[PDB]
Every structure is written in structure tokens, then in C-alpha cells.
Write a protein that binds this ligand. Structure first.
Ligand code: A1B83
Lengths: 39, 156
């Protein structure tokens, strides 16, 4: 049985940790909502 | 129960202890999450019940108490922040520049950040604090890491 709990306000934080790359990938989306890589 | 705007954890007591299966956004009295988090099942908020209102397995989105309210979009240029709510850990903003998912039906933003599967439904924000999409549906790359799409719904 599922329940929800508050975890915070939705705001932008100035000087948050900046990480992660920006990959450009060829993908396909099937009828079940699952993504897959096309190569 | 609690209908204040904000980010919420989606929890279950079906498995061992209390387990976090995902996250969602409360905005304008509507709860927004990814379909794979709840599978369209009802939710509890204190003593109150939240019933599903709209959902789609292909978009992997679901709204409760009313129609989908989030309509902001990534501008295709600027950095964004993932407001990650990891299981058992405090909400944390992480800024990143999104990549691109190129599909036969158009391009979609993508964030390359790795978090537990129980973080699915965490919102992605623009510099004004607007929710431009939810994190949790994407693909696994060569090294085993995840790249999620910036999944956004349509506000009717
Ligand atoms: O498996 C996942 N997501 C998902 C599950 C079931 C379905 C869909 C997506 C869409 N169709 C049904 C993951 C989300 C995630 N986040 C960060 C790191 C690793 C993962 S794996």
C-alpha cells in the first residue's frame, strides 16, 4: 500500500553541486515506454 | 491529507520495513509521478486517499486528483537542476547541462546523473524553479550507468 511524505520545496539552488556530462544518443521508444539505444 | 506544493517521497510497506519506490511533484492540488513508480495504484497521504486521474504507459507518466499541470520545457541551451530525493537521504539539487535523446519523432533532453532506482519521479527544474520534466526513464550505456530522459507531460 503506497503513501506519500513531503521532502521539500521545489526551488533552484544557487551554487549547487555542478556535475554530469551531456551525451547525444540515438534512441527508440517502444509501446511499453521503454527506451533502447540504436547503434 | 497534505496537499501543499512540493516534492514528495512515494513509499510502500509491502516489502521489508518502509521502502522508497519513487518520488513525485505536488502542484495545484495534483500529484505527478512516473507510471512505473505506482503502476496506476491509489496513494495515501495521511488519512486521505489520492485516486489516479490520467496516465499513459508509453509516456511513463501519471497524475492524481486532476489533470497533468506541469508544462514548462527545457530551452535546449541552459543548465538545469535535478532535485534528487534519494532513498533515506535528504532532497539535494544537482546542476547539469543536459544531453539529447534523438528519436524518429523528435529530440528530447537527457540528464546523465546516476541515482538509485527509487529516485524515479524526482523533478528537473529550470532557473525560475519551474518543473520541466521528471527523472527516471531512460537508458543504460556501455559502462552500466544510466542516462534519463527529461520526461514532460502535456497540460490540456
Ligand atoms: O528501470 C528503470 N526505469 C523504468 C522501469 C520500468 C519502466 C520504465 C522505466 C518505463 N517503462 C516501464 C530505472 C530507473 C533508473 N533511474 C536511475 C538509475 C537506474 C535506473 S533503472
Amino acid at each position: 500500500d503506497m503513501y506519500i511524505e513531503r521532502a521539500g520545496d521545489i526551488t533552484w539552488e544557487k551554487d549547487a553541486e555542478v556535475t554530469g556530462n551531456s551525451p547525444r544518443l540515438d534512441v527508440a521508444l517502444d509501446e511499453s515506454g521503454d527506451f533502447s539505444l540504436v547503434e | 491529507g497534505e496537499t501543499t506544493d512540493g516534492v514528495y517521497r512515494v513509499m510502500t510497506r509491502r516489502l521489508l520495513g518502509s521502502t522508497q519506490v519513487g518520488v513525485g511533484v505536488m502542484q495545484e492540488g495534483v500529484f505527478h509521478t512516473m507510471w512505473h513508480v505506482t503502476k496506476g495504484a491509489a496513494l495515501r497521504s495521511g488519512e486521505g486517499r489520492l485516486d489516479p486521474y490520467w496516465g499513459d504507459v508509453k509516456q511513463d507518466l501519471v497524475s492524481y486528483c486532476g489533470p497533468w499541470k506541469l508544462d514548462a520545457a527545457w530551452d535546449g541551451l541552459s543548465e538545469v537542476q535535478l532535485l534528487a530525493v534519494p532513498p533515506g537521504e535528504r532532497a539535494k539539487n544537482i546542476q547539469t547541462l543536459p544531453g539529447i535523446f534523438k528519436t524518429k519523432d523528435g529530440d528530447i533532453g537527457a540528464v546523465a546523473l546516476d541515482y538509485p532506482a527509487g529516485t524515479s519521479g524526482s523533478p528537473i527544474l529550470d532557473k525560475c524553479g519551474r518543473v520541466i520534466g521528471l527523472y527516471g526513464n531512460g537508458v543504460v550505456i556501455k559502462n552500466g550507468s544510466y542516462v534519463s530522459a527529461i520526461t514532460q507531460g502535456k497540460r490540456e
